[PDB]
């Protein structure tokens, strides 16, 4: 009865750290550095939770990707945790297309594991 997480994050060092911690708890975890294809990957692979960074590579932006996901009638139900500079969190919460949760960088991997479990439950 696997719980699946996708990390959209071009900081591969951080993504690996987060992945190991989540996998340690029993989550299945995939990673992508590509924000451009992220929405369609989410539609294909159907993760139970998305961890989405703000500052992504090749001009991609987590708030904009979150916008597309939360305006999509099919995908707006998939929980999104935004990670990044906490400065912009308060503003984005006010938007209709806000994420489900916001975790400030520096992200504590153990803390994120607990926040993931609060959103989608823990592996059993
Ligand atoms: Cl970021």
Numbering used by the authors: 1 to 124
How do the authors describe this structure?
To explore the potential for intramolecular signalling, we determined the crystal structure of the FrzS RD in two crystal forms, a hexagonal form (P63) at 1.0 Å resolution and a tetragonal form (I4) at 1.9 Å. After several rounds of refinement using data to 1.0 Å resolution, this structure was used to solve the tetragonal form. The FrzS RD structures in the two crystal forms were very similar, but the overall Cα RMSD for the structures of 0.57 Å was above the errors in the coordinates. The largest differences between the structures in the two crystal forms occurred in the conformation of the β3-α3 loop, part of which was modelled in two conformations in the hexagonal structure. The tetragonal crystals contained three molecules in the asymmetric unit, one of which forms one side of a large solvent channel in the crystal lattice. Although the backbone conformation was very similar, this molecule was poorly ordered in the present structure, and virtually missing from the electron density when different cryoprotectants were used (N. Echols and J. Fraser, data not shown). Even in the relatively unconstrained tetragonal crystal form, FrzS adopted approximately the same structure observed in the high-resolution crystals. The crystal contacts along the α4-β5-α5 face varied in the four independent molecules in the two crystal forms, suggesting that the similar side chain positions of critical residues, including Tyr102, faithfully represent the predominant conformation of the RD.
The Myxococcus xanthus FrzS protein transits from pole-to-pole within the cell, accumulating at the pole that defines the direction of movement in social (S) motility. The N-terminal receiver domain (RD), a 258-residue coiled-coil domain, and the extreme C-terminal tail of the protein are all required for the dynamic subcellular localization and S-motility activity of FrzS. Here we show using atomic-resolution crystallography and NMR that the FrzS receiver domain (RD) displays the conserved switch Tyr102 in an unusual conformation, lacks the conserved Asp phosphorylation site, and fails to bind Mg2+ or the phosphoryl analogue, Mg2+·BeF3. These results support the model that FrzS contains a novel ‘pseudo-receiver domain’ whose function requires recognition of the RD output face but not Asp phosphorylation.
